[model samples]
Target chain A: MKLSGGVEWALHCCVVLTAASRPVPAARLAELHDVSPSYLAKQMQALSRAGLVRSVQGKTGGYVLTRPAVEITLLDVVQAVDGPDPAFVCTEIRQRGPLATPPEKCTKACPIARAMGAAEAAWRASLAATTIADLVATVDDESGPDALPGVGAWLIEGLGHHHH
Target chain B: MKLSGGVEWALHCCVVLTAASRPVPAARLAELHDVSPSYLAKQMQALSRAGLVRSVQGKTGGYVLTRPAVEITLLDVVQAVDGPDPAFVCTEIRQRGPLATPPEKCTKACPIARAMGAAEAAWRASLAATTIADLVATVDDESGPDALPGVGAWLIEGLG
Candidate 1:
């Protein structure tokens, strides 16, 4: 039922990257989140592959959002990380048992299948309704005034030293 | 993203059990769906444990719904099989690394966590909104005339 926390990590990184004036180094991103550098690096690779973020090369090499934060939905991050497949896969065991009807006899989806599908659709739609920008706005509203004071300082100091 | 297919198998079995005049054997139930009797047995045991269905003993022994189908919900069956916890757990990775706010500082849930939580809540709400009876009505409406003809026949035939 649950997606990996990597989705959260990637989204958080993406949200912060949107604020970067220059490409933020991977190490900096990792330190900012206080997570295992290797683990966070793996998720970044996924985001890079999905084109959600792009990596830059050079003295201050790092990553940046490929597009506006508001354009990225939670579903986008989840799909980038989880490959858009539902956690549940119905094997159609209905076609397997004793009184088993032939596949030909079952032309339409069963109620459970339909219901589960609907539920999944609803969840995806819900995620689609939210954007990384929306999250950033909420974060700003909560932080108030200075907004992300630690964020600016931590980025300038570089991530390896700060965790939050 | 998906519930185990066993959830579907169990629901179909429960729906039929609602109209059952006698307990339906696990083997027979599996036979109807062409699934593994052992696997179906596991789902039935889950239902029994959840108090959704009860098991009977002896030669005529089988399974039966504990309550009216109208009272059973997709959520009840889903929770019976998958439990209510969301499939996705946000570890607050936000609390880690350079951004590592101490756990105590995490007074509010992460934005991503809150969004996913709201999505799960809506999903559970969708499931809670319908009952097995609603499924039956949907089945009848979708299937038209012969909604569950073979299903009813198999249950009756399995009795003897």
Candidate 2:
């Protein structure tokens, strides 16, 4: 199973935005991460649509968190970019073939379906346990206290080029 | 996230094999499911490699489960078809950017990686909790007690 790489990009953007003094443009975020601007913009747009972040219009305007970073779980970003579809899709092969069971008889979820649902539940629950704020803290712990602020300063410097 | 459709096909094939009194040909299983013979063969090949099922060589030879259905977890089948890679791959974005941390400083996994790991653990754990026997029992429950035997009889009829 594989989630799209966009989930990685979106989570990274959220971590960087945590230290931003003002809304940072998607392009600047992409520049800070050395990723493609258009690609990162798509992720940003998804975040905006999901209400995790908001886009500011104008020369100096950019993107800001819609809510506090603590309130935005990593699951929110994942759902926005990769969608909510579970990895496994049960095809109900039990109902196929010459010995097929009546449709009405298969009312409840089969064992396989139940297992997949439980697995998905566990996966989603794990993701929901983590918020964007947790990611920022972890980054700080790994890279040292100055890491986020340094990223913030770098983004601010890039934003300096924007006029109006 | 997306899993290979092969996982689903392999799983269904395993459930069908529960009824086999003898080895069933891959082509027969493919025909029974109305799926592509070539595609289903590939899934069967993967199952064989994983030791979930074994293939016999000869005119009447085909496939038989290497172990009882109760011994085969859905996770085993999934790992066989999809490989053992986790659904998420951490690119270590923390190491990137103007404030990039020294490689030596980044000894531990970040929280994001930990969270992804936990999620994967949960997913795999759930799958592991369910065995192929559990799936067969569930099918039997849904389709009535005789449902599996009916399937078995059908397969036998096809074999005849």
Identify the leading candidate in terms of lDDT.
Answer: 2
Residue pairs with backbone overlap in model 2: none
Which candidate gets the maximum DockQ versus the true structure? Answer: 1
For candidate 1, the TM-score of chain A alone relative to the native chain A: 0.85
lDDT accuracy of residue A134 in candidate 2: 88
lDDT of each: 0.76, 0.81
Cα lDDT tens digits, model 1, A1-164, are 55666877888887777667777777777767766778988999999899998888876777888888889998899889877787556677667755555799788877777887787778888989999888878878866535564575456454554443
lDDT string for model 1 (B26-140, tens) is: 6667667666767877888788888999988887787778899889988899888777677668776766653466788689887678888898887888888888888777777
- Give the worst 10-residue stretch by lDDT in candidate 1 chain B: B144-153
Name the best candidate (by TM-score). 2
Q: For all candidates, state DockQ relative to the true structure.
A: 0.66, 0.64
Model 2: share of real contacts kept: 0.68
